[PDB]
Amino acid sequence: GHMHPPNRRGISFEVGAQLEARDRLKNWYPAHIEDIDYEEGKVLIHFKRWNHRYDEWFCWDSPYLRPLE
Length: 69
Hints:
The PDB classes it as transcription. By secondary structure, this protein is mainly beta. It has no helices and five strands.
């Protein structure tokens, strides 16, 4: 019952792909897609250099994801 990833300009939904995301404190940082959950339509975000215990799942339609550019 996979759902289909959206088509978003400047974002590739692949493991290892780069983008920017806003953390819980509402700051944007560069990030990489660690995993993609086709089941629930989410992506595990790893912020560069962070301890991986701080990785966060984001709905892939999330406004708090955006391209590197």
